[PDB]
A = this chain, B = another copy of it.
Amino acid sequence: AGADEERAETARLSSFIGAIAIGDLVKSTLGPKGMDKILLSSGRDASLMVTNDGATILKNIGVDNPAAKVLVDMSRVQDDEVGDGTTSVTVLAAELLREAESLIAKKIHPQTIIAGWREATKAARQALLNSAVDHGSDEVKFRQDLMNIAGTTLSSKLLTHHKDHFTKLAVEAVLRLKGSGNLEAIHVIKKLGGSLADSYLDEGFLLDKKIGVNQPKRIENAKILIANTGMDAEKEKMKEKVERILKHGINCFINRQLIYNYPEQLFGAAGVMAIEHADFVGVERLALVTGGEIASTFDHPELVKLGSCKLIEEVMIGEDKLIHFSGVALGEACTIVLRGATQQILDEAERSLHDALCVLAQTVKDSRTVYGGGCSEMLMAHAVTQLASRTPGKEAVAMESYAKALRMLPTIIADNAGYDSADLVAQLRAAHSEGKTTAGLDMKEGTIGDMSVLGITESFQVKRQVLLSAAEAAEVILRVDNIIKAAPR
């Protein structure tokens, strides 16, 4: 075992230290004034690596004994099925830990303070609910689809000089997949070969493989075959495969594993295009697209198999050969595909398309967003301060401490702008109090202005996940009983 045993105030402190270290590095990364960062490390890194996105660097390395790594791990789940935009979820969570020093003065027990979280719901819910922020997102929508939040996600990243346009393309992908929950079957690739727009949109799925030097280049009214088992007396295997194949009219074969050489000669003459070691992730997503099939042994063809017969072909779009799957009857799942100029910046586009894709799917379906530039946060602060006075006995302590926390956010945005935040903090406060949700910190202005004109909106999901996760972590470690061994691993 390891047996590192935590005692009262020396338990709370480890959580406290982890939060402060993360906040300074992540703070400069936010929005339009976001910045790239580089890292050099001990062990096997041997050099300085630069990642604009905070989440990618945190998972790669677990530097020291206090455990902040687990808090870090959670952000990815957010990133794959929602996620990023700007990194603020970690920052807000960290700031709530500072107040705990104040809490020892209270000196009862942390759990009584925990009442703040029920009220975190009441104070915050009013805050998200202070309204405007979201235009409404009617459904698909002609121009509100983008030139908003995806563009800002890109803003912290340099590729935005010509990649603002790439971001615009991504919303089209989310609109066609709306309904039945969210994200499944979305993938993106980039091709070396320049164009001003830097992109091509495929109505189907993009795969990078070829059967061999021989085989028909284009297939029509294609049938798709997926096998759980590889192709690998021998002639009898050859004979079974040919007999079943001709009747179906099979135009393409996709198998997720190693493929045997004998069938390959047959596929070329037959007029059937096969793919060696096709990636499973593409196949499962593809299956929703083609209606799928139950993949068994060679008995698999015809009815137990369901293929989509619109158009499959391998297309030279520039340099590297790719295969285009097109014509999804289901309509539920689609891809996108990207082009470039042949630059380091282009590979960065790959980095941010994922960033763009996740935000919009959630933005459209949740039917909510918040005003950026701290508009939502200052307004939230004004509403919460009166709330503490309103609440009774056990209610009126937890909520009050939470309320002053919101004050710091306006201050952080003003400084990164460069203007004096002291003037800024209450000049800002007066505008939110007045009733303009659209008003907030304008970094470009240097004072306060209209956020809505700017076009910065934050996904409603990015804001709820951050606030709930912020202190749940704080309360769990202090409580910890009979800790066992050590190290997250």
A-to-B contact residues, CB < 8 Å: 1-5, 21-22, 24-26, 28-29, 33, 35-48, 50, 57, 61, 63-64, 67, 70, 108-109, 111-112, 114-115, 117-118, 121, 158, 161, 234, 294, 303-304, 343-344, 394, 415-416, 418-419, 421, 475-477, 479-489
**Does A111 lie within 8 Å of B481, measured CB to CB?**
no
Q: Of B40, B45, B111, which is within 8 A of A480 by CB?
A: B40
Q: Which residues of B contact A158 (CB under 8 A)?
A: 111, 114-115, 475
Can you identify 18 A-B contacts, CB atoms within 8 angstroms?
Answer: A2-B41, A21-B485, A25-B484, A28-B480, A35-B479, A37-B480, A38-B480, A38-B482, A39-B480, A43-B485, A43-B488, A45-B484, A47-B70, A48-B70, A111-B158, A112-B418, A234-B294, A234-B304
**Does B36 lie within 8 Å of A483, measured CB to CB?**
no
With contact pairs A111-B158, A117-B344, A344-B118 given, residues A40 and B415 touching in the complex (Cβ less than 8 Å): no
**Does B35 lie within 8 Å of A481, measured CB to CB?**
yes
- Bound form: Cα–Cα A121–B344 in Å: 7
**Does A482 lie within 8 Å of B22, measured CB to CB?**
yes
Nearest CB in chain B: distance from A138 CB, A: 25
With contact pairs A35-B111, A48-B480, A415-B109 given, residues A40 and B475 touching in the complex (Cβ less than 8 Å): no
- Bound form: Cα–Cα A4–B42 in Å: 9
Q: Which residues of B contact A5 (CB under 8 A)?
A: 40
Q: Which residues of B contact A39 (CB under 8 A)?
A: 3, 480-484
Q: Which residues of B contact A419 (CB under 8 A)?
A: 394
With contact pairs A42-B3, A48-B476 given, residues A481 and B37 touching in the complex (Cβ less than 8 Å): yes
Q: Which residues of B contact A481 (CB under 8 A)?
A: 24-26, 28-29, 35, 37, 39
- Bound form: Cα–Cα A38–B488 in Å: 13
With contact pairs A40-B484, A475-B36, A484-B39 given, residues A418 and B111 touching in the complex (Cβ less than 8 Å): yes
**Does B118 lie within 8 Å of A161, measured CB to CB?**
yes
With contact pairs A3-B41, A41-B3, A234-B304 given, residues A61 and B112 touching in the complex (Cβ less than 8 Å): no
Q: Which residues of B contact A415 (CB under 8 A)?
A: 109, 111-112
**Residue of chain B at shortest CB distance from A43:** B488
The residue among A40, A111, A480, A482 with the most chain B CB atoms within 10 A of its own CB is A482
Nearest CB in chain B: distance from A237 CB, A: 11
Q: Which residues of B contact A343 (CB under 8 A)?
A: 118, 121
Q: Which residues of B contact A487 (CB under 8 A)?
A: 40, 42, 46, 64
**Does A35 lie within 8 Å of B482, measured CB to CB?**
yes
Q: Which residues of B contact A1 (CB under 8 A)?
A: 42-43, 63-64
- Bound form: Cα–Cα A112–B24 in Å: 17
**Does B418 lie within 8 Å of A63, measured CB to CB?**
no
**Does A33 lie within 8 Å of B112, measured CB to CB?**
yes
Q: Of B26, B64, B344, B479, which is within 8 A of A38 by CB?
A: B479
Nearest CB in chain B: distance from A395 CB, A: 10
- Bound form: Cα–Cα A45–B114 in Å: 27
- Bound form: Cα–Cα A48–B108 in Å: 26
Q: Which residues of B contact A25 (CB under 8 A)?
A: 481-482, 484
The residue among A22, A35, A304, A484 with the most chain B CB atoms within 10 A of its own CB is A484
- Bound form: Cα–Cα A63–B421 in Å: 43
The residue among A40, A118, A344 with the most chain B CB atoms within 10 A of its own CB is A40
Nearest CB in chain B: distance from A393 CB, A: 9
With contact pairs A39-B483, A484-B41 given, residues A33 and B3 touching in the complex (Cβ less than 8 Å): no
Q: Which residues of B contact A22 (CB under 8 A)?
A: 482
- Bound form: Cα–Cα A340–B101 in Å: 30
Nearest CB in chain B: distance from A362 CB, A: 21
Nearest CB in chain B: distance from A287 CB, A: 12
**Does A37 lie within 8 Å of B479, measured CB to CB?**
yes
Q: Which residues of B contact A44 (CB under 8 A)?
A: 488
Nearest CB in chain B: distance from A211 CB, A: 16
Q: Knowing that A109-B416, A111-B416 are A-B contacts, what are 17 other residue pairs whose CB atoms are under 8 Å apart, sorted by A's residue number?
A: A3-B39, A21-B482, A22-B482, A33-B109, A35-B111, A36-B475, A36-B479, A36-B480, A38-B479, A39-B480, A42-B487, A43-B488, A45-B484, A48-B483, A109-B421, A112-B415, A158-B475
**Does B4 lie within 8 Å of A40, measured CB to CB?**
yes
- Bound form: Cα–Cα A378–B98 in Å: 40
